[PDB]
Symmetry: none
Subunit: 407 residues, 2 copies
């Protein structure tokens, strides 16, 4: 009767309008604090992200076979009991199982029969008494775990994760203020492509990062770091292409930062940096230079060397003037320059054809140069500037610009 009434309150026609889309453009169904998991949910045939959040003590019925598109099973805080044919369906079919949880009963005991798993994030604290990682000792059974995002506050990297690491590639360890004592356990892990020690309170970069030769994406966010002197040992890594250094307390940069020519997305933002050396521009592959909310007094001119640079974001700095050779770059896609103390934009910004979004809300612009209307791909929406400063443009020039905006 509970299941029938559950289908009655939330019919297939009722949840048909409830059908929403996620970031990955997959159909999702956010089921939240619902008394049971409904069969009208299952009558759908293209749901890919079954969003099971906080559904207490419910048996998943055989009707889940109707979800032909079900790749990602998002089990959040849900006590989920399931039958034997559907266990077999899990060992042969399911490819992604994204689990948020708090309890080892909330995480289910029937996902270690699962074998076809290829993607999973765990979210929720796992430090517990007498029951640590015997939950996921079936990671050894999970022979295809490449994506393991961990917003789970692990105090130390599991060794079963290491034995998995033959195929593990992405480890986003958001420990939330807990240090990951790697103790060169990642030295055994010679096959990683990515490592993200996010908010792990390092203050010192471990050597297990440098000792590898396959890492491509390193993200050291919010580590309270002071010096980056160790990148001379980064020349062993021949595939490093991105360093997102978000939200740190770095007082100054050395010059040897110019050595990593392989770097493309070098972030150095939200820091206390007072001097950028010219040597830094020895790198040639730099593509995403996000220097937002910094203490930079001026953009260096030698930044014109970066011919691959696409998204250069230098918002909320103390940048006074823009030098000419800064505008030697033509591949710039997103120039976020707002909240600065800039007095004017040089006319070379009119040379930019790829100009799509230029943030000029702030600065000290007396009048906008007319060449800003020359940019064809730039519409009025992309022109982020104060209206009082914007209104200097000519009438028919404004007509052409509004024609571009409405097109």
């Amino acid at each position: 009767l509970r299941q029938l009434n559950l289908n009655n309150e939330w019919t297939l026609d009722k949840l048909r309008q409830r059908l929403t889309k996620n970031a990955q453009d997959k159909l999702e169904l956010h089921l939240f604090m619902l008394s049971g998991i409904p069969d009208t949910v299952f009558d759908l045939v293209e749901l890919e992200v079954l969003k099971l959040e906080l559904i207490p003590d419910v048996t998943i019925p055989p009707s889940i076979a109707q979800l032909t598109g079900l790749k990602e099973l998002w089990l959040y805080h849900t006590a989920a009991k399931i039958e034997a044919p559907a266990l077999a369906f899990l060992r042969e079919n399911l490819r992604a199982l994204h689990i948020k949880f708090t309890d080892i009963k909330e995480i289910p005991l029937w996902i270690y029969s699962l074998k076809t798993l290829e993607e999973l994030h765990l979210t929720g604290n796992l430090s517990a008494e007498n029951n640590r990682y015997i939950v996921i000792d079936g990671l050894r059974e999970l022979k295809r775990l490449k994506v393991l995002r961990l917003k789970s506050n692990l105090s130390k990297l599991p060794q079963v994760v290491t034995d998995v690491g033959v195929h593990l590639q992405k480890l986003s360890i958001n420990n939330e203020g807990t240090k990951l004592i790697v103790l060169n356990s990642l030295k055994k892990m010679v096959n990683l492509t990515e490592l993200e020690l996010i908010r792990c309170d390092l203050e010192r970069i471990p050597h297990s990062i440098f000792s590898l030769h396959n890492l491509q994406e390193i993200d050291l966010k919010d580590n309270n770091l002071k010096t980056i002197e160790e990148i001379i040992s980064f020349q062993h890594l021949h595939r490093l292409t991105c360093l997102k250094l978000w939200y740190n307390h770095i007082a100054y940069i050395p010059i040897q930062i110019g050595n990593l020519t392989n770097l493309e997305r070098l972030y150095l933002n939200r820091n206390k940096i007072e001097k950028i050396p010219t040597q830094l521009f020895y790198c040639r592959k730099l593509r995403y230079l996000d220097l937002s909310h910094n203490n930079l007094t001026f953009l260096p001119a030698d930044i014109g060397l970066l011919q691959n640079l696409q998204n250069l974001a230098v918002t909320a700095n103390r940048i006074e003037a823009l030098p000419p050779e800064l505008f030697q770059c033509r591949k710039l896609r997103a120039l976020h320059l707002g909240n600065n103390v800039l007095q004017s934009l040089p006319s070379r910004v009119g040379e930019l054809t790829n100009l799509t979004q230029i943030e000029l809300r702030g600065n000290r612009l007396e009048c906008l140069p007319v060449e800003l209307g020359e940019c064809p791909l730039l519409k009025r929406s992309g022109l982020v500037v104060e209206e009082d400063l914007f209104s200097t443009l000519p009438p028919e020039v404004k007509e052409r610009l509004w024609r571009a905006d409405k097109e």
Copy 2:
């Protein structure tokens, strides 16, 4: 039963009616004098600012996890008791938090367990008896707190605040008529970017500020200085961008502040200024100034050196004409000359087309010129010129001004 009744009675349509927009264009819900908190409030996902004011018997249900845009929750005079899954959701979703209370009675306990928030605004008397900064001893675990406004009529700076501040960025101090005992304890805490002091009745600016080299915005409103021999000592600090000394009693401003070209904002309105010498105005790049309701007989000549203005004021004083020195300036956008005795209006001030908002109502002008007729930029909603002589102004002038009130 009352909580349940408030749940069903508050429909989603009436609730969508109650959603307004705040300053940040963010959707705000003002929950005013509700006996409980409707679950339909948490049903509507468009909410961002949840203002719940003087709502008793509050048990915030975790259905608020289904609400998507919640970054503000405005707890006013409320004994809040949140649930643990809601604790988990707001640890990753909420980003700002204002709290109003009456001592320990309406201070909630779940606020400390949330450790990812940015803004923690506290309202109400924290200077209670027998609890001298011992309730806030649990703030040490917060490492992500960067904005902390303290308006609780504090007697002394809490030592726990000194311990916590190491990761702070924004701090505001409001005492509303109480002499704070700072006792020069700010030398420890170096990361601070914005510091404010409003109506402290000090007259003696402390010394611990100079050990900090990161303060950009300093607000000293209503501090009633009379001889600022501190701006010769403010030369030690080379980070302050805008000084805010308005509604003071400055007899004369000492000349040394003329040496800081980075100063961009001179808020000095409603003062007891008799004469202010020249060398104050050696700084060229000052945008916003306010000098309303004074006793100045002539605006000093070296304001003519100021070439980057945006706003001034000659409200309610004994100045009859605009000097040619002010005409050496070229950037007079806004002013405040209302209810004053200005007689002569030359063509130099009148040709300033970018005149943004000048108060002129009640001014004792003789006649108003026909230069307010044609141009579509300088018009009434911009310039509120004297309406006694706006009647004798030509009807085409009135056409431009009423065009302002329409366009």
